[PDB]
Design a protein around this nucleic acid. Structure first.
Lengths: 96, 98, 83, 76, 109, 97, 111, 99, 80
DNA sequence: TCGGATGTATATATCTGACACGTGCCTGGAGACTAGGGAGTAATCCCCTTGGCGGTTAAAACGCGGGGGACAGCGCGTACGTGCGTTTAAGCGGTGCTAGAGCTGTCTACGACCAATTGAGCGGCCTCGGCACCGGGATTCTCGA
DNA sequence: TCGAGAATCCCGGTGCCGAGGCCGCTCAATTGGTCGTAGACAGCTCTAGCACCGCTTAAACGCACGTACGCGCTGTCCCCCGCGTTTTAACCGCCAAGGGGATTACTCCCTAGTCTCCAGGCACGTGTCAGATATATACATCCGA
């Protein structure tokens, strides 16, 4: 008689919060707001990458599409920092 | 003899007090009745979830506050302090609505 | 039960409080009716979209997801109620 | 009560109606008298189109008023 | 025999689920095929944005001598930063409020 | 000389124009504008239908999704007339075989 | 074993726009996993209706100006003078269109 | 005596004449030079198709015309006849473009 | 390279006259030049980003249309 | 320029309901292997962009007289803010009930996939008529008296 | 009130280029057949949305009074507007050079699909302390004299 499983992003948001501020909690509605924010940004980036891949007569989305979509969407400083983080993560994953 | 403030002080006090808080302003039951009456015209015998009414109220209040901000700017632009309906009409015309 | 004349439930002090939060100081005597009209138009559009969203799914109860989707369709998305 | 309709063929047809008549009823009348199926004919009165979901009374068609008939190809 | 499993998130050194992002990308009807590097990039970007917003909101909360975060703190953090305000220019946050500003003309003489 | 083939809605637009106005031409720029208009409307309607189908966790796009997308996108009278025309066309296609 | 003479899907529905091309575009556009057998007919009918309306208004505007061809100015005049069509294309600029001839009342000369 | 028109007549004549036609209003070559100079800051040794420059010109002119219409409305609302920079600033602020 | 001065005063006057303005002050020109510069900067940056992703050297007419469409300013009649 | 009255921020006790954390487990993610087509790379063709030279003529820049519009100052009366006594209905706390949303089985009708083929649609050519241009006269306005 | 000049529009002759139509052909939409599963229908269960009843008290209402601001009127001064004359560079036509966009063929390797195994994240249950209330008090601020 148990309910169905509902996916969410709470665990990772909480882990990041404990990483940044080690002694600060968070209420429920703030968590809901953050979940909505993450989902909305994911949708925007994915849609832009899909359209960009469609324009160039291609049938797959790679890291280049994500990078260019991030450059198009975000403003300057955020774009630069996000690009640096993404390329560092990809290099680290490939190296191992 | 009773102590009276000059016209204008209580207005600023209310401005500060209501810009410091976050609670809703319009009462609940009249808004629910208005929502049901408006929705009656599209499909009869409808039922609502409470969260839907809450979301509608939140969105409407935010929209009204933004419109009033723009109206205040329009009224100030023409060497005036009191807002008038023509200010609302000009703001809505410029914003891109009909 | 049929309802009638409920637009007047938005009292004058409520509009005054909304204006005070908006930063206004002096209000003329003809603002209230115009505000009542504007709010009616806004609610009419939003509920119109929400009812269609509900009707496509062969349901009979309007859900918060329908309201969120209807708001998002008009470029005024809302955070804090899911989705 | 009587309305003249100037057709695209140069012929004027007289229709007996009432001010409270509806456009589906006058379409039935033109079906009965000429047989041109209803979806094909549009009426213009005082430069304004006649729509099905209204009443001749709304468009204010009175005695000896004239209408313009137009035909558009709409196969099946 | 077989070796023990290590999550892709652990390989990339992140806190977001790479596998879930890959599944969502595949099932989201965005393209015919999905590369093996896109989830890492997307997870890194999302984690960076979340960390930035959380840091600003936590600072705002600590200013008001409180231990927990409420939506007003998120609203204050977003609206007081330029780029974040531009990114969320058409978004309303529930239970947010406004910024305390008054035009200079209305002030008493 | 090898030239790739490009697709456009030119001939169908011309057919409709000659159907509605017996004696009237059209220039090239107007044809380009009409092509862009048709493509834009198609993209909008198809995207809305796809989103609506995704919301209800279904995997198929039918005429019902198209009808609801049309009702959501267009204003009143245009929506009514478009719905009527689409239903009539679908019925005519189904009846014939 | 004699294959019958071909009949285009647009011919059965009494249309002009191509049903098959719309069906292929829907299938290959990454919109959904599978596409039903009724959607292209509906889409073609709607597109045909909208094109017919626009062309009717533009042709009327062109004939008003004693011309036998349609140029972008006529399309702009037709679109901007109908409230519903104007609302539909609210955020679209059409090349070589111009503007509607209006002048504010107060600016007019006195007396 | 030489025949002069009262100040204002030629303005209305120009209004009618220029909103009757549908041509462009900025010379092509200076606009092309400006576009090239602006684009130089983002990537060196670039090339342009003529139709791209034409599209940019059309979009810019349309945007400027709409902005000027809104500015004129703002000017008229304040019981004036001459447009001023503050009117442009107010229109851009209400439109949501300027921060 | 002060090519922004190529937008002469009579051109701005013609644009305003088509807009419907009757009287113009003496300080509108600088504001108009600034606004035009900002608008062109944004659009050209987006177009150049598209061209860079496409791995080309000449910006085409299509990516200008794409950049204009991204900002909700769709354009008709240029091969869209 | 001082001084009385009012509203707000500061400090202390207290008790509740939401936040943080431990378990069980089951479904989704990871390890190992194949096969097949999407994309990168080298080579060729030729189209369209960049560059320069001469004229010629319309558009831009400069200067001047002056009339009309922007702006400051002042008087008036009316509408709006503040405070008080009275009346109304929202909000809380329970109690009953049933329509309807959500889940589980199953079973068929509908849509994907593949081979043969044929007629719809696109590229190249050409030809003549609808529109652009120049010259002329009738008309409709403005601004002095 | 009236009349002399400029600007605009209607009409006629004429020439040019692009819009409409005709052939030829290659690729994609048809026709015919098979097979797997997506969803439509029927039944069951439990929740939450609707209806009601009573009481308390905070908020909405109506009214009197005083004053500050919205608006019309007058005067001044100066700064855009219309017009003539001189300068300049935009535009049009022509001629050259070659870089880079657009196809075509070939090959290696990256991702989809399948199977097996196991642990990470979710629903459930429980404790305890962060903070929302209530009370009392000190200080900042406003309006008169």
């Amino acid at each position: 008689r148990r309910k169905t499983r509902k996916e969410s992003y709470a665990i990772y948001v909480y882990k990041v919060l404990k990483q940044v501020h080690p002694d600060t909690g968070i209420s429920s509605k703030a968590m809901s707001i953050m979940n909505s924010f993450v989902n909305d940004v994911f949708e925007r980036i994915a849609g832009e990458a899909s359209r960009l891949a469609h324009y160039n007569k291609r049938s797959t989305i790679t890291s280049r599409e994500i990078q260019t979509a991030v450059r198009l969407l975000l403003p300057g400083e955020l774009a630069k920092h996000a690009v640096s983080e993404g390329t560092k993560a990809v290099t680290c994953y490939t190296s191992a | 003899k009773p102590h009276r403030y000059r016209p204008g002080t209580v207005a600023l006090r209310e401005i500060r007090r209501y810009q410091k808080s976050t609670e809703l302003l319009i009462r609940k039951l009249p808004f629910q009745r208005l929502v049901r009456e408006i929705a009656q015209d599209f499909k009869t015998d409808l039922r609502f979830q409470s969260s839907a009414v809450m979301a509608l109220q939140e969105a409407s209040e935010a929209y009204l506050v933004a419109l009033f901000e723009d109206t205040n700017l329009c009224a100030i632009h023409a060497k005036r302090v009191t807002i008038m309906p023509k200010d609302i009409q000009l703001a809505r015309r410029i914003r891109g609505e009909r | 039960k049929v309802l009638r004349d409920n637009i007047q439930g938005i009292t004058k002090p409520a509009i005054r409080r909304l204006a005070r939060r908006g930063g206004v100081k002096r209000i003329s005597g003809l603002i209230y009716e115009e505000t009542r009209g504007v709010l009616k138009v806004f609610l009419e559009n939003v509920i119109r979209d929400a009812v269609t969203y509900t009707e496509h799914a062969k349901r009979k109860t309007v859900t918060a997801m329908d309201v969120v989707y209807a708001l998002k369709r008009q470029g005024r998305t809302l955070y804090g109620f899911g989705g | 009560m009587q309305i003249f309709v100037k057709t695209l063929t140069g012929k004027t047809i007289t229709l007996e109606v009432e001010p409270s008549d509806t456009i589906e009823n006058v379409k039935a009348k033109i079906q009965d008298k000429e047989g041109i199926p209803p979806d094909q004919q549009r009426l213009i009165f005082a430069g304004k189109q006649l729509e099905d979901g209204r009443t001749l009374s709304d468009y204010n068609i009175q005695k000896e008023s004239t209408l313009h008939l137009v035909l558009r190809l709409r196969g099946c | 025999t077989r070796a023990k499993a290590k999550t892709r998130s652990s390989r990339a050194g992140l806190q977001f689920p790479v596998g879930r992002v890959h599944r969502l990308l595949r099932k989201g009807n965005y393209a015919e095929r999905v590369g093996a590097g896109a989830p890492v990039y997307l997870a890194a970007v999302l984690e960076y944005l979340t960390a930035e917003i959380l840091e600003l909101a936590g600072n705002a909360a600590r200013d008001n001598k409180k231990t927990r975060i409420i939506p007003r703190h998120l609203q204050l953090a977003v609206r007081n930063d330029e780029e974040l305000n531009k990114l969320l220019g058409r978004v309303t946050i529930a239970q947010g409020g406004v910024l305390p500003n008054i035009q200079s003309v209305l002030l008493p003489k």
